[PDB]
Write an enzyme that holds these catalytic residues in place. Structure first.
Site, short mmCIF file in Angstrom:
data_model
loop_
_atom_site.label_atom_id
_atom_site.label_comp_id
_atom_site.label_asym_id
_atom_site.label_seq_id
_atom_site.Cartn_x
_atom_site.Cartn_y
_atom_site.Cartn_z
N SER A 44 -17.99 5.41 -2.07
CA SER A 44 -16.64 5.99 -2.12
C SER A 44 -15.52 4.95 -2.07
CB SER A 44 -16.46 6.97 -0.96
OG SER A 44 -16.35 6.29 0.29
N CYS A 45 -14.32 5.40 -2.41
CA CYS A 45 -13.11 4.58 -2.29
C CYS A 45 -12.92 4.06 -0.85
CB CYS A 45 -11.87 5.38 -2.73
SG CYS A 45 -11.66 7.03 -1.98
N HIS A 55 -5.45 9.77 3.90
CA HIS A 55 -5.90 9.75 2.51
C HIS A 55 -5.03 10.59 1.58
CE1 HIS A 55 -8.59 9.59 -0.93
NE2 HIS A 55 -9.35 8.72 -0.27
N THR A 70 -15.43 12.53 6.41
CA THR A 70 -15.81 11.48 5.47
C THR A 70 -16.98 10.70 6.08
OG1 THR A 70 -15.10 9.38 4.48
CG2 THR A 70 -13.92 10.13 6.43
N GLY A 71 -17.91 10.27 5.23
CA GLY A 71 -19.06 9.50 5.67
C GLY A 71 -18.91 8.00 5.48
N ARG A 82 -6.02 14.31 5.04
CA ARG A 82 -5.46 14.34 3.70
C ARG A 82 -3.99 14.63 3.81
NH1 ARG A 82 -10.12 14.48 0.68
NH2 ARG A 82 -11.86 15.70 1.59
N1 LIG Z 1 -10.01 10.21 -7.06
C1 LIG Z 1 -10.44 9.25 -6.24
O1 LIG Z 1 -9.66 8.65 -5.51
C2 LIG Z 1 -11.91 8.89 -6.21
C3 LIG Z 1 -12.29 7.61 -5.83
C4 LIG Z 1 -13.64 7.27 -5.80
C5 LIG Z 1 -14.58 8.22 -6.16
N2 LIG Z 1 -14.20 9.46 -6.51
C6 LIG Z 1 -15.27 10.39 -6.88
O2 LIG Z 1 -15.48 10.27 -8.29
C7 LIG Z 1 -15.73 11.55 -8.88
C8 LIG Z 1 -14.69 11.87 -9.96
O3 LIG Z 1 -13.48 12.39 -9.38
P1 LIG Z 1 -12.09 12.61 -10.18
O4 LIG Z 1 -11.00 12.28 -9.21
O5 LIG Z 1 -12.10 12.01 -11.56
O6 LIG Z 1 -12.13 14.19 -10.41
P2 LIG Z 1 -11.52 14.81 -11.74
O7 LIG Z 1 -11.36 16.29 -11.48
O8 LIG Z 1 -10.32 13.97 -12.14
O9 LIG Z 1 -12.70 14.56 -12.82
C9 LIG Z 1 -13.58 15.62 -13.23
C10 LIG Z 1 -13.85 15.57 -14.74
O10 LIG Z 1 -15.22 15.90 -15.02
C11 LIG Z 1 -15.26 16.81 -16.13
N3 LIG Z 1 -16.43 17.73 -16.11
C12 LIG Z 1 -16.47 18.95 -15.54
N4 LIG Z 1 -17.69 19.54 -15.72
C13 LIG Z 1 -18.45 18.68 -16.43
C14 LIG Z 1 -19.83 18.68 -16.96
N5 LIG Z 1 -20.67 19.73 -16.77
N6 LIG Z 1 -20.23 17.58 -17.66
C15 LIG Z 1 -19.41 16.53 -17.85
N7 LIG Z 1 -18.14 16.47 -17.40
C16 LIG Z 1 -17.61 17.50 -16.70
C17 LIG Z 1 -13.95 17.58 -16.08
O11 LIG Z 1 -13.56 18.04 -17.38
C18 LIG Z 1 -12.98 16.58 -15.48
O12 LIG Z 1 -12.24 15.90 -16.50
C19 LIG Z 1 -15.70 12.56 -7.75
O13 LIG Z 1 -17.05 12.79 -7.33
C20 LIG Z 1 -14.96 11.86 -6.63
O14 LIG Z 1 -15.45 12.31 -5.37
C21 LIG Z 1 -12.90 9.80 -6.55
#
Ligand SMILES: NC(=O)c1ccc[n+]([C@@H]2O[C@H](COP(=O)([O-])OP(=O)(O)OC[C@H]3O[C@@H](n4cnc5c(N)ncnc54)[C@H](O)[C@@H]3O)[C@@H](O)[C@H]2O)c1
Ligand SMILES: NC(=O)c1ccc[n+]([C@@H]2O[C@H](COP(=O)([O-])OP(=O)(O)OC[C@H]3O[C@@H](n4cnc5c(N)ncnc54)[C@H](O)[C@@H]3O)[C@@H](O)[C@H]2O)c1
Ligand SMILES: NC(=O)c1ccc[n+]([C@@H]2O[C@H](COP(=O)([O-])OP(=O)(O)OC[C@H]3O[C@@H](n4cnc5c(N)ncnc54)[C@H](O)[C@@H]3O)[C@@H](O)[C@H]2O)c1
Ligand SMILES: NC(=O)c1ccc[n+]([C@@H]2O[C@H](COP(=O)([O-])OP(=O)(O)OC[C@H]3O[C@@H](n4cnc5c(N)ncnc54)[C@H](O)[C@@H]3O)[C@@H](O)[C@H]2O)c1
Lengths: 338, 325, 335, 337
Positions: B148-149, B176, B208-209, B229
């Site tokens: 994670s971030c 966050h 958070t873990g 949050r």
């Molecule tokens: N935003 C942050 O700060 C951050 C940082 C590190 C990790 N993450 C993790 O990374 C991951 C992505 O998060 P995010 O912020 O981009 O969320 P997001 O909602 O921006 O991204 C989700 C995307 O996945 C697509 N999607 C939906 N169903 C799908 C399917 N069946 N097949 C393929 N694509 C599909 C959607 O159309 C959408 O564009 C999450 O698991 C999050 O926990 C997020």
């Protein structure tokens, strides 16, 4: 019947102290002073509130006095607009107890100006460099009527931390602890990056930023709880919410405890000697759930976490505006009964 | 350059592409997202509320995504499967960033070799750059997670303080930013009731873990934590409360971080910073010297900033970059 | 009292229940939502970021929601498909369709298959007839109107004002802007909204231009204004309460004092509780929880000349509308 | 290059300096702000929550402000006088002074700068009596011999007037009413507080949509005389830190389709109003114009028409940065006269 009260500074605290006074009916506000708010404007600012909603009752101007009623009681409030607190005629108005809530008369020397106008007691609605500090439910019985004429009700954060810290320290003994408070925006902050010469970070646009800030609130707990002097300190993050804040206390315990034991100690205090000061919840709450809450501190049992029996993180909410305001009224009631 | 496929063109997916273009250490050859057509993809990459307009050109030509910043030009094939032909595209590395395949091996059948989950995984091995990336073993790790971030922020800081003074125990809070998993107004979040509450209105306690996850990167079992949050669009901060083995002045702590910051992910600042000052910062963790506080030489509170979007997305690229070597 | 069922326990669904309990003019006996179980329903009904803690007690007993201020006993169901909900069995005569996903008559008609008789869709409908209380609700026809629409929050704000102004001075033409609070269709951060791209951009960061048929719809509920009104919206980062900005041309010239009097007379009379008048220096939070359809902001209005004016009207897009849903049920039940 | 002094190192004061450094068409030699000492000035310029870290280097050396972008360096004298009459613009060499305090907007008050050795003063706001100019609209009516105290009008007026000119020249505006949906500014409050003259403005900015009066549409009639008495409007302040939008509802002399209106705006944007008025057909939102240097960006798709003679036209503006660039442009223009 009820202690007669004057309010200096009709701001967030000044106005909500009046709201709390009318609802609790334990004091009688007879006067208000604010050179930046005339009587008609006072009516408007008291009537409408972005955070706490429309005043539940009626408010108007009559005869150069603020008329505030909730059906049951009616307050006839004299209105002044003096910049120099020494010029406020509290004595004529019968204001025995004065709430000093302008934010600029926080020392004993400056606050004593109200005594020249005929007040007997002054409660500074903020920490003081030299005036003795009190937190209801924690050290208010140490108040000394013959020698304490200018006192402080501490800060909102200290009023949240101290009742919880007292409960935990009494039961388990806190060797040392570190506090973070995630705090709502206040009137000292800015809407967009602006001048804050003494505190540069506090000038940055409140709505855009998470803002690191120093506070003596945790250290001040050592002043209302002497046995913890030097055992607590902390800081704050200011975040873009209009009201309600949360205390995050990380502490080391002398006597080991499970979270069940901690919950039990807090609930006992909440249901007993600290009723109305410290509350306990097990619900999945967020900050808005405490808008208008009258408690000093609401222990969030489900949000707490422990690493081990002697090292824990305790979470407690507070409406920094309305909780604190209710304690100002309670502090006046207490010392008047003395 | 290693050839990369991206599943899910969301905040991480799109910003990974952005960091990839700037760093020019990878070659993006494919993207898949069934809720985003190619015309919609151009727009979402071009305009960004948080990080501004893409610095370069992006458009659709020949059913392909065309991305350029002047220096390089990337031709990106587009698919819309919820079956992705990664092999044909030459996509060796697949970033699984939908957030819902934390399942992941499905990408290998399409012809992928290594897969990077853009989130912690319950069963896939976790790695964070600067802490445990050299523990990667190419022969056995084909489905992996970059954590994670928050974890990428805490561990580098944890490493320096622990190496220098030794952390007996510590408790972490992260303040966050709002994310896409949250709600604009009070709505359904059946598994996590508090996360459904209106994001713009609320301080929201959340689990958070990340501190636990640091235990994977000698500090296992010595750290745990939680989150609040808050209503900001991006950038978060770590608030680490720790007990030290060997006593230290703040001057001594600042010195250890500054020395490390200038040498071997983590940066040091002594300025009067706030959250927006780190929007677009590529570091995993930025130590805030003036915001730190000590009770005594063995009990201190350490503050570290991170752009939860851009730091991690940059790391997605780097984990790909390191493992290709 | 009319017995009511609610499909979709969202912002509108939950607040229709709140408005129902406060008004005590209908009796809610059933609720359906496949994404919210009975215990979660209690939590969502109990705590509200925008409107505060429920003033009363709410609990779950025997697979029923117990809500009291009077006491309402509510049966709970969890079907995604409205054909499987037993409104008839539970005794739910009128069903509030507040899911946001069955806005067509054919789709909404599924509630009739479960044993409901009259249905009020909590939104505009493409083919189902629309009604606005205080404006065209008397055109309701019990014999032929069994699937109906209570229009939009925005339409419920504009139409009553439009009616007063048109009746009194005559509106030749008008263009509406609504500065609108964030709703559940928006995103916390830049995300996918394939049919409507701007609506996908982070709500807290942005002013977002958006299309609305609310202004055109006033022409459907007030036929004489058909083709004489349209408008658009800006979504802004507030959690609730919106405002209508109507720029219109008048046939008969009028001073603002005269315009004020026409609205106040209506507010103090036939449109009491629907249209309200204020002269205070109000801002949006002052209308949080306001039950009116429209609050005319006299001091924010401006005119260029007696025949070209800009009229400002506030509305709690959540709670005003939720109350109108209740009033409409009570109305058609009086039929 | 014209040498410039800045009074009031606030949002406009600071972003004018930023725009000056980037455009490199003026030379900033002095700045005054009594609530911001030199060390604090460094910080406030370096870090900006809205517009990001300053792209260049900034430091304090010898009681002077040193601002550089690698190529050029501005050496800036720093003062902290409350009375503008006491500022030594001449000694520092500030021929043109940007008056960006918000509290010296009348000609008499602005004239205080003349006593310090300044020749020209540009009030960064509308003025009750000082003449107003909008680049791309009426700046060629500037009269060097007689106009020494001038106004760059308001941000909103700089957005409306260029669009108003284009639509009016091509179709004729019979009359129009404007709404601007406006970002929060420094005159507002973080929580409900005192704003004695303007009660609504005192209510907490982050919580509220706030109705506000503005003379911006009426002011277009002064920079475009034929539209005098034909425009007025008002504002809603909303909780965003920057970027605002103009909502102009107008009646046309000559009937027009929206496609003809778009075409008329496109022509102006790519020709005589280039850099002042821009045209877009994209699905934009406010953050897409954070840092945009144009005075007015026409949002073609957000526009809507009722009938050929009654239309609603939508135009964006970075109220901080668009206006700041125009301040510099106005200095650059009048100095070339
Ligand atoms: N935003 C942050 O700060 C951050 C940082 C590190 C990790 N993450 C993790 O990374 C991951 C992505 O998060 P995010 O912020 O981009 O969320 P997001 O909602 O921006 O991204 C989700 C995307 O996945 C697509 N999607 C939906 N169903 C799908 C399917 N069946 N097949 C393929 N694509 C599909 C959607 O159309 C959408 O564009 C999450 O698991 C999050 O926990 C997020
Ligand atoms: N707001 C909170 O959350 C909170 C909580 C606890 C304590 N406090 C403390 O209480 C005090 C009041 O804070 P606030 O939030 O109400 O601030 P505020 O700015 O809302 O109120 C200040 C008021 O004092 C008035 N004032 C200024 N100068 C004056 C003078 N010379 N005479 C009389 N009145 C004058 C102002 O017009 C204003 O109405 C502060 O010291 C603050 O630290 C605030
Ligand atoms: N929110 C407003 O301001 C407002 C005002 C007037 C009208 N409306 C309209 O009323 C409707 C309700 O809007 P909202 O803000 O309550 O949305 P919301 O997201 O608050 O409500 C959606 C709810 O419907 C439920 N739902 C989803 N699928 C379902 C199904 N198949 N069967 C039953 N329930 C299902 C979800 O669990 C969710 O609780 C919308 O269509 C909206 O356009 C909204
Ligand atoms: N912010 C915008 O969007 C915007 C756009 C166009 C025009 N304006 C106008 O620009 C002017 C400045 O506005 P702003 O938004 O930068 O406000 P601001 O509060 O950010 O800037 C005002 C600055 O002037 C300084 N100041 C105050 N009194 C002074 C004095 N006596 N002498 C010298 N300096 C003094 C303050 O310390 C502050 O830094 C106002 O007239 C405003 O109307 C603002």
């Amino acid at each position: 019947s009820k202690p007669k009260v004057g309010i200096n500074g009709f701001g967030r605290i000044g106005r909500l102290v009046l709201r709390a006074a009318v609802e609790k009916d334990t004091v009688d506000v007879v006067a208000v002073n604010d050179p930046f708010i005339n009587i008609d404007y006072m009516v408007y600012m008291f009537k409408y509130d972005s955070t706490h909603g429309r005043f539940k009752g009626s408010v108007s101007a009559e005869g150069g006095k603020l008329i505030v009623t909730n059906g049951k009681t009616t307050h006839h409030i004299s209105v002044h607009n003096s910049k120099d607190p020494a010029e406020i005629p509290w004595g004529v108005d019968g204001a025995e107890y004065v709430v000093e809530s302008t934010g600029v008369f926080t020392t004993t020397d400056k606050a004593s100006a109200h005594l020249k106008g005929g007040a007997k007691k002054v409660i500074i609605s903020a920490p003081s460099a030299d005036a003795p500090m009190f937190v209801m439910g924690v050290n208010n019985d140490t108040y000394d009527k013959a020698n304490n004429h200018i006192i402080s009700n501490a800060s909102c954060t200290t009023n949240c931390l101290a009742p919880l810290a007292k409960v935990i320290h009494d039961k388990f003994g806190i060797i040392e602890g570190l506090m973070t408070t995630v705090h709502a925006t206040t009137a000292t902050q800015k809407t967009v990056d602006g001048p804050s010469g003494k505190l540069w970070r506090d000038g940055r646009g409140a709505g855009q930023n998470i803002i690191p800030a120093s506070t003596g609130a945790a250290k001040a707990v050592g002043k209302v709880i002497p046995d913890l002097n030097g055992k607590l300190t902390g800081m704050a993050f200011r975040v873009p919410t209009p009201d309600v804040s949360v205390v995050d206390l990380t502490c080391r315990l002398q006597k080991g405890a499970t979270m069940d034991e901690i919950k039990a100690a807090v609930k006992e205090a909440a249901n007993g000697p600290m009723k109305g000061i410290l509350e306990y919840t097990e619900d999945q709450v967020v900050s808005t759930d405490f808008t208008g809450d009258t408690h000093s501190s609401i222990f969030d049992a489900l949000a707490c976490i422990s690493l081990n029996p002697n090292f824990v993180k305790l979470i407690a909410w507070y409406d920094n505006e309305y909780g604190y305001s209710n304690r100002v009224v309670d502090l006046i009631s207490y010392i008047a009964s003395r």
